[model samples]
Target: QSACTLQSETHPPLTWQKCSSGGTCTQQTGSVVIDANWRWTHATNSSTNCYDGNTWSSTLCPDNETCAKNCCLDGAAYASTYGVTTSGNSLSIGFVTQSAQKNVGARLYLMASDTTYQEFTLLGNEFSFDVDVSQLPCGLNGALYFVSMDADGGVSKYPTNTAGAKYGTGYCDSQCPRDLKFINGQANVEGWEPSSNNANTGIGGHGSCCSEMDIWEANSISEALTPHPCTTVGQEICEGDGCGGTYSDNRYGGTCDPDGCDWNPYRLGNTSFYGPGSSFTLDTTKKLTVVTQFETSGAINRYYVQNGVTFQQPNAELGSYSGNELNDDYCTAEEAEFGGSSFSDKGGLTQFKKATSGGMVLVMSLWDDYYANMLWLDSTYPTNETSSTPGAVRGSCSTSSGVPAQVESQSPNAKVTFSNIKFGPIGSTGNP
Candidate 1:
């Protein structure tokens, strides 16, 4: 699709730091751009919307080729329209933004320049960030993750896409989402179907697929770090159920691993390790620092800092596994005990390292799940399964607590803030 001249696109400035093993650090000025899916797409040279709500305009977008040529993607209003704001080293995104239209959640990408996205090569490095999730509740997810997305937003591969990275055009994850309005530089309106439970979302014919490294996926009550590897390298397009993931009937039908090997304190039987109280090891009521070390040996370790004290990740106490870090051995045992071979089937840590070696783009988003009510993260998943099962219970939330309508109306002002991002060699970004 084309770029709209109506609304001038402007990115919100944010700053981060790169540190050295010697304890020296240098600041890097960056910016953030909203995902294209949240932008307004209208008919070229007209104010009429090519995509209204969750449906494509039949007249302007009756077909994929015609829609790609007939529509234009517009810029965002940032704070006023999407509730995104930034201060020196921090960025805050609101959960529900009410403007001319209602916006439920938001997703943003870090920009290295006006025309490109900031790519992070995380292998053999440490990445640290400070977060405040006090306002986030049960069903909502305040996520900070990395995905193998194209830096130029696929503009080099598809000439039809003129908006590029500057407009947050290219996005992909292990979920192989089919909610994107455009894929492969073409309009994804051919078989669009509006979501039954959500007014702002719908399913399209194509899905965007890629590897995803979840550094943080949390709310006030629980958290997790997962690595979802894929057979595909960078961003790719798949068709219908062949795409798999959250959009498909069979989540494991695609090339990517829908069920990742996760390291969650509560899910691993360390229920008292993290929560919203001073009694907990790492309370969620206040801001805290999170540091993740990606070792050269292919091991991933996590640490948390609060009140000037460092807390190591708790070891899994439920199964035969006793390690806190993630490695080939941990993943192998996790799948064997928790069930599902998607992680190993989709290349496991070997492929995960390969995806990161080539570099990946950083993503921060605040979203609520419509299909599962986020039960997989904060409550008992597969409601039919008994809670006594090893992996059935993930958190303390009630099974019915994450209904989208309930959270959207009850916590309209809920938000999450991420600040002080730093990257460096292991043991450099944080005190180990």
Candidate 2:
């Protein structure tokens, strides 16, 4: 039997209760207590006291401002004290972020390493994590997801080669001279957005095996273009309201400036998929208990549990979508709209299962939503493409040390706490 340490004799006799999971420890509520100077004090109220057992953050800093600066470095923050603490019955993965610069994020895994996500089979397993994301800087988003790196040699796919292959940087895809590269599957709680003050639980599956390409004209107008039935060839006029400007082709003899032409073409492919717009949203002030259930039904019977269900009152259907309506093309879109892989093979749930036969890990992260739609199918937040001084306002970030610095500046106490992580077989973990 492990003994509970009674650090000091300043309070009443500490009571130790045996946990159903096999360990024995009592809830030692204290006055201004710190967990061995590493783990942050779990606080719930402004009294600088009150244990909520839900929201925990570093007490190393006196205020939110200082917390943002000192709590995010290699030490003095979650990264330093963070790891998987396993007991016979429960696994506690702790994370805390405090940095003077940009925003911060963290992750935990059931598998040994992230590089081999595709080697694990995780169909009937259920994952549960409790998150209190009530506080965070604007634009900085967090998520709990399962991802797979199943293409172009895993992480080697990036920093590309000239030809757009895994090592080169040019153009390649099902329709191009480029190697298709991107992440395939993910089911997550897409953190908080200050603009809309909401959080969503969504799904994404589909590698960017198909998208669009950037085309231009060379010397001979006739030889320069591959004439598709409906598409025009070189020197063709640019017209119509959708053209942004009104004009015709200069092929005959106008300013046929090759550099001036803008051609964007998309092939028919559907490897990337997203859940419908706004899976679900709630007030960040309250703690959120997210339970994702899996089924043998091609994962089509999945559900996103809401706090609306209780013992006295039960809920039969929890997810925002029905099983029959769950398909890849239903609510999916391209990541970088400029160009992507386009193939006729639009795989659905079945394809997703086949593509990623490996089991998955429980991931937690804090990053930016750099797209025009902000991943919520709306533009309430600024985007890297549209914002002039991006990261200056909402919906932006920087690779520079302080990416979430903007977030820290606005909401110094901006951090999310995740705990109570559990995973087991289909009905073994209390799945619905």
Candidate 3:
């Protein structure tokens, strides 16, 4: 089609007066992206107290020495081997596996200063990014997320997690209120927008209200590998005999098993119009933009610009979901805090709302999933290092003095470049 057909659909139409580099170019999306609303700050595992009073602090580097050793900073702080470089508002992070334990990259935070969480209203805000993952190494789990956590009294520094004591440090502390991520690629890649009531620990929100975290589980074991809404609970597939193990809890009707088996259920499927109805993949090589809009009404919608084209096509639906309006009958009065049967707007359970209520920080990271990388490293998330089935304990994946602590490389050359990042009132221009 002609350029005119594609111009009007995008946030900002085509522009002129641009000159230079010669060969008539289409102005490939990644080749000429520019925007400057983000306060990109250098955050490393070294910022020990960045978010110490928070639960997701585990997402940070386990220690300072390791962080300084591999942390890559934009601007003039490019001092690591992770291949991090900046070209405008875009902060590019790149890395390749040279050894079993040396495949580390970089991290960047979007804040107003050294240690503050960018606190914007989620009800009428949008977040978007331009990423070129065509050349990303296979089995790599690249992540761009908004984690909910307290931001300290506005002093501008990393905040601590509330559940640090229970979840431990490093990768031990996982679950966030909400996250939209792109799982392993190279094939059958999945993109999901899911939320968690602090792993349904009966305290974060949903966990405390009732105890049917299983209600938000995947229909099948295989489907559980990727993040989706919960479907089955007591059957062979959903419960034990399926992917994980025997979840013989009669909370809804049967016997009283371990009241916590379903605490951290597999995945709860989409529950809204915009939330990606089913798992899908985006073309890697082409330049693309991912946009997410969080409405104050507790509704979150996702959209995308394909190959520089606007999101007016019939199949452009990216991902989104309104956790507050979920029709599930399991949640009762207790579930009120986490989008239960109440409409009090307890920030609902959607990541956007939870981020709003629980407090969130913008984080970007890339790495391999631990425990044999069931999510990206292995064939699927179920195939652990030792067991092809689920429920098997994960072997030592630590690189800081644990088994196979050193990364071994067959040949090393891997990298990922982030070209642009934009955040502001929803519908704000994403053009550079």
Candidate 4:
């Protein structure tokens, strides 16, 4: 998509830290830009909308190449339009923002500059951040993850994508989302279908695929750390049911692992560990520091700090898996117990290392799930499955909860705050 001449793009500045082994940290100034999907797309030389309310304008976007040439992605108004704000070390995103067009959720990327995204090589390092999910509810997810996306947002590869990283262009994940309005630098208008339930969203013909490391996918009651590895590297576009993710009829049909081997405290048989009250090991009513360590041995470990007390992630006591960290053995046991083969089928940790070792871009977002109503994250999934089934009972949330329309209206004011991001050698970011 072309850059719009209407609204001038401005990124929200945020400051984070890089630390030494001894805990001496230095601040790094970065900025954040909203994804192009959330931006306004209009005719290049006029105010006419190229895409409006989940449907492409036939007049302006009759064909893919014509849409790419005629449409321009305009800049965002940040807090005013999308409810994204940055102050000092913190970045906050609201669930719903009322504007000329209602903005329900937002996805943002860390920008190294106006032309590129900040890439983090996470292997053999510890990444820590402070998060307050007090205002987030059952259906909403405040996610902070990493994906192997191009630093320049595909400008080097896709010549049609001139807006590039400055417009938050290149976005892909383990889910291989087909909802992207633009894929591979061109409009994904072919065979587009507007969402039956959501007025502001739709599915396109193509889906973008890549490796994803979910450091955090959480609300107040439950949280998870999952690694979704793909056989393919960097950005790849897939079509239809072959895409395999939240968009496809068969979620396990694609190259990437859609249902990653997740480590959720509640799902791992530590139900009393994290919740809203002080009786819980780590109360969610206040802010807490989360640290994830990526060991050279290919193990990923998690730790949480609340009120000066550090808590190591508990071992999986539910199934045959017994490890606290995610390793080859743990993943194998998880897949075996859960009756899944996607992780291994997609090359597992070996591929995950290949996808991440080079570097990855950070993505932060606030969203409510349209598919499965987030039951896979915070409630019993495959709702037909019995609770006794391993991996079926994920959290305490009822199967009926987390419906998008209900959550969007019931929790419109919900928001999440993420801050104090730091990276360094193992144990340097926090008390890990």
Index of the highest-lDDT prediction: 1
User: Model 2, residue 25: displacement in angstroms?
Assistant: 19
Model 4's number of clashes is: 0
- Residues 1-432, candidate 1, lDDT per residue (tens digit)? 888979899999999988888878788999999999999999889999999888989999998889999998999999999999999999999999888899988999999999899999999899999999999999999999999999988899988998888888989999999999988789999889899988888999899999999999999989999999999878889999999999988999999998788988898888898889888999899999999999877779999999899999987754566778888888988888888899999889998888878889999999998989999999998888988877888888887778989998999999999999999888788532
Error of 4 at 137 (Å): 0.8
Which runs of model 3 end up more than 4 angstroms from their true locations? 1-77, 97-103, 115-117, 150-282, 312-352, 357-359, 372-411, 430-432
Q: Where is model 4 more than 4 Å wrong at Cα?
A: 318-320
Comparing candidate 2 with candidate 4, which one achieves the higher lDDT?
Answer: 4
Clashes of each: 0, 42, 48, 0
* TM-score of every model versus the real structure: 0.98, 0.38, 0.43, 0.98
Lowest summed lDDT across 10 adjacent residues in model 1 is found at 315-324
TM-score of 2: 0.38
lDDT of 3 by residue, 410-432 (tens): 21344555545655665663533
Shift in Å, residue 319, candidate 4:
4.7
Candidate 3 or 1, higher TM-score: 1
In model 3, how large is the Cα lDDT of residue 158? 19
Candidates by TM-score, descending order: 1, 4, 3, 2
Candidate 4 clashes between residue pairs 3 or more apart in a chain or in different chains: none
lDDT of each: 0.91, 0.26, 0.29, 0.90
Q: What tens-digit string does per-residue lDDT give for candidate 4 at 1-432? A: 989858889999999898888758888999999999999999888999999888999978887788998998998899999999999999999999888878998999999998999999989998999999999889889999999999999988999989999999989999999999999888999889999999999998899999999999999989999999988967899998899999999999988999887888888778899889888898999999999999887789898899999998987753565768888888888877877899889888888888668789999999999988888888887888988998787788887669987888889999999999998888787522
